[PDB]
Design a protein around this motif. Structure first.
Motif, PDB file in Angstrom:
ATOM      1  N   UNK B  30      90.049  74.003 -17.061  1.00  0.00           N
ATOM      2  CA  UNK B  30      89.669  72.571 -16.678  1.00  0.00           C
ATOM      3  C   UNK B  30      89.627  71.347 -17.525  1.00  0.00           C
ATOM      4  N   UNK B  31      89.379  70.119 -16.595  1.00  0.00           N
ATOM      5  CA  UNK B  31      89.606  69.155 -17.135  1.00  0.00           C
ATOM      6  C   UNK B  31      90.877  68.848 -17.878  1.00  0.00           C
ATOM      7  N   UNK B  32      92.006  69.825 -17.321  1.00  0.00           N
ATOM      8  CA  UNK B  32      93.222  69.421 -17.731  1.00  0.00           C
ATOM      9  C   UNK B  32      94.051  69.440 -17.071  1.00  0.00           C
ATOM     10  N   UNK B  33      94.823  68.039 -17.149  1.00  0.00           N
ATOM     11  CA  UNK B  33      95.862  67.331 -15.796  1.00  0.00           C
ATOM     12  C   UNK B  33      96.561  68.642 -14.635  1.00  0.00           C
ATOM     13  N   UNK B  37      91.652  73.345  -9.858  1.00  0.00           N
ATOM     14  CA  UNK B  37      90.632  73.885  -8.495  1.00  0.00           C
ATOM     15  C   UNK B  37      91.586  74.972  -8.151  1.00  0.00           C
ATOM     16  N   UNK B  42      91.047  79.983 -10.492  1.00  0.00           N
ATOM     17  CA  UNK B  42      89.766  79.420 -10.436  1.00  0.00           C
ATOM     18  C   UNK B  42      89.245  80.704  -9.446  1.00  0.00           C
ATOM     19  N   UNK B  45      87.761  83.864 -11.467  1.00  0.00           N
ATOM     20  CA  UNK B  45      86.594  83.612 -12.074  1.00  0.00           C
ATOM     21  C   UNK B  45      85.166  83.630 -11.440  1.00  0.00           C
TER      22      UNK B  45
END
Lengths: 287, 117, 69, 299, 48
Positions: B30-33, B37, B42, B45
């Motif tokens: 997450x917070x990965x360019x 989401x 995702x 999960x």
């Protein structure tokens, strides 16, 4: 009632009601004659107008019984009960179910539907009867409760003419300043409403229109007319047409109220003796 | 978000604990360019269990394409219309725990010619 | 969100060039708490912290290291 | 003609079959009560409410009392047979993790809620179950036992009503009055479950459930709706630093993020309204709500 | 017909049999819900 439901149970005009009551009287008469307990047209059989008069006096007694309930009762619950009682005898006869059992039962079922959550001691305390006799009546009350819903077509909601009254008065406090502090109007309107409730008005007219007519009668009695309010409702669909219908309904309501009178007790006791003798007559159902 | 080709994202903790099984998780930190989401991994999960569910519910499924045990771990972004139907969208390759987006054979050449000239 | 490898100080720097005159002086020796890296690394501390802080001590104050080891 | 015995119920028993009349499939209810007292209270309040309310509420997302009879002591209520229920469906181990299908279920539930709120009659007890899915999959709401009208006249408003796992925060306090708030917060917990896949806040008993709701949304701010402690029964709950919605359900599309934030808002006044929620742009978006033709079915 | 929000003389009057009350207001049920139910129900019908 834009909520439908009572849209099916809104009988439209005086004659149909008259006819239905008459037909149920005939129905009981015939079933009994066919069973052949008796030869046709004996003295015992009653007449529909006499049955209606007995019902109205006994119903005024039932309204007093609702008023003397020891726990405080919302006007909605009393009304629900009366309506349920009138609608019940539009399908059956006074003799088939004695009016006393029907009145008490309409009252308990009504309390259960309207969420008054009545306490069991409070209900027994209100009745002026011996506990054993009250329990005998309560046993019948159970069976006649299910019987009521069966002949009520399971249509339980009843529209009560109150809510509209509060609402029109708030509209009064806001849209029209011509009249002022309309509370004298409030009490007189209540007086007109009890008299309206005793009539077949609940069955025929729309309840909101009933409240509006009570307000109009109060205003005419005291010195104000609501042409302007009627004019704001004219600020609406039907253009000119809405007003003529409103005036005709108001006139018919005034006529029924002026004509309606409480049945005399002297006449009522004669009728009572006759009906009592009637249920004391042999019915007996089946094995 | 200006240019996804010109962004690199990393994280030291996940670096020593990296294995063929955890590559998707590293992309998923997450917070990965590069990853989003909206991707169904995702959603999986958020729900429970990861099995043949990518072939049942068909859609955005980031899946490992080729793997070298120490560092090289290539990921591919697919859009499925139905089971046994795969449409490749893009490829993100991870070298030394550093994620880059695979340059198009032609966008790279255009920029290259522009700088030289 | 997506922070980069850390940038150079931009808050200061502009003052340090100045006009080559009236420069900001060396900051004073803050003899208290600082934040190098992520650890506080505050001043005034010992070398081997006593094992009494954080764990039980099974050895008496005689502590003849050679015999107790 | 009774043809099946699905089983007994909380205050009822059910059989599935075709009636004395047409061959069409329907579920038949038989009245259940403790009649031992020689002074029985006749029929139960839950039954009375349920029958008339279902009869009145007629909507493509509301089940309805169709036929109704009662020759014997028995009272028979006729409701259409449905396929199963969302609750067991998502309860089971992931058979089909279906993203936009959850959004379609939410849309049907919200349309049903809008109709019930418009008719001026609160559904007192939506619980995770008590929601039924039919063969087509149009989901219509069902259990109506605890519902009541909500109006201008002041009356003893019933208290401590919804199942503990799904309980409105104002009701958890001990509030004497209420509004669409209970139903809205509860749809909110059901959505929570569809996304999280397990129940959001677990409460063994009243106080623990209130503590868990507070832990999930943080301590309510003083600005929120001060008087939150001024309602009749309040206990300062833990001063949680608080967690963003992002913390409890880690992720999804932010539009969903917004519906959630909104149903949750603490001031009962701001709890979003039914029309308001449909009007949310999340429903009108690139992800399309399932028509129900492709809606997931288990066994 | 009748609008959902009042912001009119009816809201300004803010008066019922007991008007509005503060402690229960936490309960919600701002009289607003109140006059709306009241009027809507009254207006329901008027012409069969």
């Amino acid at each position: 009632h834009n909520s439908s439901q009572k849209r099916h149970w809104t009988f439209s005009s005086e004659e149909q009601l008259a006819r239905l009551r008459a037909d149920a009287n005939r129905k009981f008469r015939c079933k009994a004659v066919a069973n052949g307990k008796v030869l046709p047209n004996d003295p015992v059989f009653l007449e529909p107008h006499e049955e209606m008069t007995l019902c109205k006096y006994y119903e005024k007694r039932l309204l007093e019984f609702c008023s003397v309930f020891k726990p405080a009762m919302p006007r909605s619950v009393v009304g629900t009960a009366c309506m349920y009682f009138k609608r019940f005898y539009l399908n059956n006869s006074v003799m088939e179910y004695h009016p006393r059992i029907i009145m008490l039962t309409c009252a308990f079922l009504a309390c259960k539907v309207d969420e008054f959550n009545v306490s069991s001691p409070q209900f027994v305390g209100n009745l002026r009867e011996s506990p054993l006799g009250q329990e005998k009546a309560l046993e019948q009350i159970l069976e006649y409760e299910l019987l009521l819903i069966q002949q009520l077509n399971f249509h339980l909601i009843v529209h009560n003419p109150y809510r509209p009254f509060e609402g029109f008065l708030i509209d009064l406090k806001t849209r029209y300043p011509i009249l002022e502090n309309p509370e004298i109007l409030r009490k007189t309107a209540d007086d007109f409403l009890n008299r309206i409730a005793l009539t077949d008005a609940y069955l025929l007219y729309t309840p909101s229109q009933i409240a509006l007519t009570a307000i109009l009668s109060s205003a005419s009695r005291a010195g104000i007319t609501m042409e302007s309010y009627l004019s704001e409702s004219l600020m609406l669909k039907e253009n000119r047409t809405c007003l003529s219908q409103l005036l005709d309904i108001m006139k018919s309501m005034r006529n029924l109220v002026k004509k309606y009178e409480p049945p005399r007790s002297e006449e009522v006791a004669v009728l009572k003796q006759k009906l009592e003798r009637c249920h004391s007559a042999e019915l007996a159902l089946n094995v | 978000r200006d240019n996804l080709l010109g962004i690199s994202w990393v994280d030291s903790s996940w670096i020593p604990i990296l294995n063929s099984g955890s590559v998707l998780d590293y992309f998923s930190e997450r917070s990965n360019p590069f990853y989003d989401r909206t991707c169904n991994n995702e959603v999986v999960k958020m729900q429970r269990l990861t099995l043949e569910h990518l072939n049942q519910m068909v859609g955005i499924e980031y899946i490992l394409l080729h793997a070298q045990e120490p560092i090289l771990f290539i990921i591919r972004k697919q859009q499925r219309q139905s089971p046994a139907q795969v449409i490749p969208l893009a490829d993100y390759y991870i070298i030394a725990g550093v994620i880059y987006q695979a340059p198009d054979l032609g966008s790279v050449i255009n920029s290259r010619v522009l700088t030289a000239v | 969100l997506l922070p980069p490898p850390m940038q150079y100080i931009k808050e200061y720097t502009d003052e340090n060039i100045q006009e080559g005159l009236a420069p900001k002086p060396p900051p004073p020796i803050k003899d208290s708490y600082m934040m190098f890296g992520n650890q506080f690394q505050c001043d005034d501390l010992i070398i081997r912290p006593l094992e009494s802080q954080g764990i039980e001590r099974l050895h008496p104050m005689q502590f003849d290291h050679k015999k107790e080891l | 003609e009774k043809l099946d015995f699905l089983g007994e119920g909380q205050f009822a028993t059910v059989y599935k079959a075709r009636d004395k009349n047409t061959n069409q499939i329907v579920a038949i209810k038989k009245i259940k009560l403790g009649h031992r007292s020689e002074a029985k209270d006749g029929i139960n309040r839950t039954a009375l409410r349920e029958i008339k309310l279902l009869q009145e509420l007629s909507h493509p997302n509301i089940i309805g009392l169709l036929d109704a009879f009662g020759h014997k002591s028995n009272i028979s209520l006729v409701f259409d047979f449905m396929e199963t229920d969302l609750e067991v469906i998502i309860k089971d181990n992931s058979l089909v993790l279906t993203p936009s299908h959850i959004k379609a279920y939410m849309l049907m539930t919200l349309q049903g809620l809008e109709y019930l709120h418009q008719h001026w009659i609160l559904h007192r007890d939506l619980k995770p179950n008590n929601l039924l899915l039919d063969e087509n999959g149009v989901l219509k709401l069902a259990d109506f036992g605890l519902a009541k009208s909500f109006g201008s006249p002041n009356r003893a408003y019933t208290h401590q009503v919804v199942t503990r796992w799904y309980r409105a925060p104002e009701l958890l306090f001990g509030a004497r009055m209420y509004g669409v708030g209970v139903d809205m917060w509860a749809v909110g917990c059901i959505l929570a479950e569809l996304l999280l896949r397990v129940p959001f806040l677990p409460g063994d008993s009243d106080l623990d459930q209130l503590t868990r709701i507070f832990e999930t949304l943080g301590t309510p701010t003083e600005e929120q709706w001060p008087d939150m402690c001024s309602l009749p029964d309040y206990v300062t709950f833990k001063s949680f630093p608080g967690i963003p919605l992002h913390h409890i359900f880690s992720a999804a599309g932010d539009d969903l993020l917004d519906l959630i934030q909104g149903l949750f808002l603490f001031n009962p006044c701001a709890r979003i309204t039914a029309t308001q929620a449909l009007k949310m742009k999340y429903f009108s978006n690139r992800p399309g709500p399932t028509p129900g033709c492709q809606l997931p079915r288990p066994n | 017909h009748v609008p959902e929000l009042e912001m009119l003389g009816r809201l300004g009057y803010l008066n019922h049999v007991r008007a509005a009350s503060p402690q229960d207001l936490a309960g919600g049920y701002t009289s607003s819900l109140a006059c709306h139910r009241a009027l809507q129900d009254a207006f329901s019908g008027l012409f069969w």
